[PDB]
């Protein structure tokens, strides 16, 4: 069998920054108390993974990235009770310990057990389960899904519908939920409102989805890559504009187009200039601007407090404000009920081994979501 013993398998290891992933053989130690070992089936490529590669988002190296996945439970550790061998699961990039001041808070989701605030690169108990040639490998967001097998904490995995198309539902682990929820939960987009979405990757496009589902009258998609416009309009964008086409700042362009500014703006890129423009594009007296994109480490904005004093609301969120373990299975249950489709987001599918090609596709601007099959 496999249960109880160290598994030898392949995973995409990142030894140095700005380097290609190296699929090597890694040793995956068995699950400990309240931990779960999962056999990865599908994993999507998110901009956040690329941020680590570029050194934009700091995390301890060497490390095994990936966090937008789905697989089957191989073994359960001592005391696990929510999932069992053979169950279909989605590992949670943000856990739900249930005992947190935040977890007990019906309005928030950023559990204290997260490894995002002060990245250690381990499991919640302070240790690693990965080894590549006698050297320990760090975990990423507590789930490290760019591996054929991974051990995560029990509160960091949710059991989903067994009839789930894992190659599709994996996007619910980050991309879709983050995008959709930012519009629905965080911003609370009102019917008949006007929205602005900067960034048309998988997360940004899911935000347009959330805006349409919320009944937005107008949904202006913004991106320097025009090839994304078709997918944008398909998913709900009333209009698409490219900043490169105008002589004046995009915020002014947008304000001119919407009688002073949009009701809800979203930044789904991860840049300071677009974050500012996004805040500046919502109406100064009633606009709400949500930060979705992850900005480069240790880079600060230069903001005027007056921009808020007039009546603006500026907020941010992780995973669309969704409590992970509790909502993820619910989102999957809504997918199975044809509430929303994930197909338009998936443009490419390659085998796990072609991971580096998947990142090349992202940089090319040709893909939205590329799913890696194990």
Ligand X SMILES: NC(=O)c1ccc[n+]([C@@H]2O[C@H](COP(=O)([O-])OP(=O)(O)OC[C@H]3O[C@@H](n4cnc5c(N)ncnc54)[C@H](O)[C@@H]3O)[C@@H](O)[C@H]2O)c1
Ligand Y SMILES: O=CN(C1CCCC1)C1CCC1
**Scanning the structure block, which residue is given the tokens 């559990």?**
111
CB of 92 to ligand Y, least distance (A): 8
Question: Using CA atoms, how far apart are residues 335 and 23, in angstroms rounded to an integer?
Answer: 32
Residue 137 interacts with ligand Y (CB under 6 A)? no
Site for ligand X in 38-57 (CB under 6 A): 46-48, 51
Is 97 labelled as part of a ligand binding site?
yes
Which of a second copy, Zn ion, ligand Y, none has residue 97 at its interface (CB below 5 to 8 Å by kind)?
A: Zn ion
Residue 83 vs 291, nearer CB to ligand Y: 291
Which residues lie below 8 Å from residue 30, measured CB to CB, with a gap of 6+?
Answer: 3, 4, 5, 6, 7, 37, 75, 77, 151
Contact at 8 Å (CB) between 258 and 280?
A: no
Q: In the numeric block, which tokens belong to residue 343?
A: 């197909």
Which of a second copy, ligand X, ligand Y, none has residue 286 at its interface (CB below 5 to 8 Å by kind)?
A: a second copy
Q: Coil, strand or helix: which one is 81? A: coil
Site size for ligand X, by CB under 6 A? 32
Question: Using CA atoms, how far apart are residues 151 and 147, in angstroms rounded to an integer?
Answer: 10
Residue 268 interacts with ligand X (CB under 6 A)? yes
Is 142 labelled as part of a ligand binding site?
no
Residue 40 vs 93, nearer CB to ligand Y: 93
Which residues lie below 8 Å from residue 233, measured CB to CB, with a gap of 6+?
Answer: 221, 240
Residue 29 vs 102, nearer CB to ligand Y: 102
What DSSP character marks residue 319?
A: G
Span interacting with a second copy, options 83-91, 99-107, 198-206, 332-340, rule CB under 8 A: 99-107
Other Cβ atoms closer than 10 A to 256 = 12
Q: Coil, strand or helix: which one is 261? A: coil
Residue 294 interacts with ligand Y (CB under 6 A)? yes
Which of a second copy, Zn ion, ligand Y, none has residue 94 at its interface (CB below 5 to 8 Å by kind)?
A: ligand Y
CB of 192 to Zn ion, least distance (A): 19
**Plot region of 235 (φ>0 → left; ψ -120 to 50 → alpha; else → beta):** alpha
Residue 284 vs 360, nearer CB to a second copy: 284
Residue 120 interacts with a second copy (CB under 8 A)? no
Residue 71 vs 179, nearer CB to ligand Y: 179
Cα-flanking dihedrals φ and ψ of residue 325, to 5°? -60, -35
Residue 295 interacts with a second copy (CB under 8 A)? yes
Q: How far apart are the first and last CA of the chain?
A: 20
Span interacting with ligand X, options 12-20, 74-82, 193-201, 338-346, rule CB under 6 A: 193-201
Cα-flanking dihedrals φ and ψ of residue 188, to 5°? 65, 55
Residue 362 interacts with ligand X (CB under 6 A)? yes
Q: In the numeric block, which tokens belong to residue 195?
A: 């929205």
Judged by CB under 6 A, the residue of 157, 222, 280, 342 near ligand X is: 222
Site for a second copy in 311-350 (CB under 8 A): 311-318, 321
Which residues lie below 8 Å from residue 119, measured CB to CB, with a gap of 6+?
Answer: 58, 59, 60
Residue 67 interacts with ligand Y (CB under 6 A)? yes
Contact at 8 Å (CB) between 347 and 367?
A: yes
CA distances 342 to 50, 175, 176, 223, 356, Å, are 21, 10, 8, 21, 23
Taking CB atoms, the residue at the shortest distance from ligand X is 201
x-or-dash string of contact with a second copy, 44-83, rule CB under 8 A: ----------------------------------------
Residue 199 interacts with ligand X (CB under 6 A)? yes
Question: Using CA atoms, how far apart are residues 136 and 6, in angstroms rounded to an integer?
Answer: 14
**Scanning the structure block, which residue is given the tokens 């050297």?**
135
Residue 46 vs 328, nearer CB to Zn ion: 46
**Binding site members:** 46-51, 67, 97, 100, 103, 111, 174, 199-204, 223, 228, 269, 292-294, 317-319, 369
**Binding site members for Zn(2+):** 46, 67, 97, 100, 103, 111, 174
Q: Which residues are at the interface with Zn ion (CB under 5 A)?
A: 46, 48, 97, 100, 103, 111, 174
């Amino acid at each position: 069998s496999t249960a109880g013993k160290v598994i030898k398998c392949k995973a995409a290891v990142l030894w140095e920054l700005k380097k290609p992933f190296s699929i090597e053989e890694v040793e995956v130690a068995p699950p400990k108390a309240h931990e779960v070992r999962i056999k990865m089936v599908a994993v999507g490529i998110c901009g956040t993974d690329d941020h680590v590669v570029s050194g934009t988002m700091v995390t301890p190296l060497p490390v095994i990235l990936g966090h937008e996945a789905a697989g089957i439970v191989e073994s359960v550790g001592e005391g696990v009770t929510t999932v069992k061998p053979g169950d279909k699961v989605i590992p949670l990039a943000i856990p739900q310990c249930g005992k947190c001041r935040i977890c007990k808070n019906p309005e928030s989701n950023y559990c204290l057990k997260n490894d995002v605030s002060n990245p250690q690169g381990t499991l919640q108990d302070g240790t690693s389960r990965f080894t590549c040639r006698r050297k320990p490998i760090h975990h990423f967001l507590g789930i490290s899904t760019f591996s054929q097998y991974t051990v995560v904490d029990e509160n960091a995995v949710a059991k989903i519908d067994a009839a789930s198309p894992l190659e599709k539902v994996c996007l619910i682990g980050c991309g879709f939920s983050t995008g959709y929820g930012s519009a629905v939960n965080v911003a609370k987009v009102t019917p008949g409102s006007t929205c602005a979405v900067f960034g048309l990757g998988g997360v940004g496009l899911s935000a347009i989805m959330g805006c349409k589902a919320a009944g937005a009258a107008r949904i202006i998609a913004v991106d320097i890559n025009k090839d994304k416009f078709a997918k944008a309009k398909e998913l709900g964008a009333t209009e698409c504009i490219n900043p490169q086409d105008y002589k004046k700042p995009i915020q002014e362009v947008l304000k001119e187009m919407t009688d002073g500014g949009v009701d809800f703006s979203f930044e789904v890129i991860g840049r300071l200039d677009t974050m500012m423009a996004s805040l500046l594009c919502c109406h100064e007296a009633c606009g709400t601007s949500v930060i979705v994109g992850v900005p480069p480490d240790s880079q600060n904005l230069s903001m005027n407090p007056m921009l808020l004093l007039t009546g603006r609301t500026w907020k941010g969120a992780i995973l669309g404000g969704f409590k992970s373990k509790e909502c993820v299975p619910k989102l999957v249950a809504d997918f199975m009920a044809k509430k929303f489709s994930l197909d338009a987001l998936i443009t490419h599918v390659l085998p796990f081994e072609k991971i580096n090609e998947g990142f090349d596709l992202l940089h090319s601007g040709k893909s939205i979501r590329t799913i890696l099959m194990f």
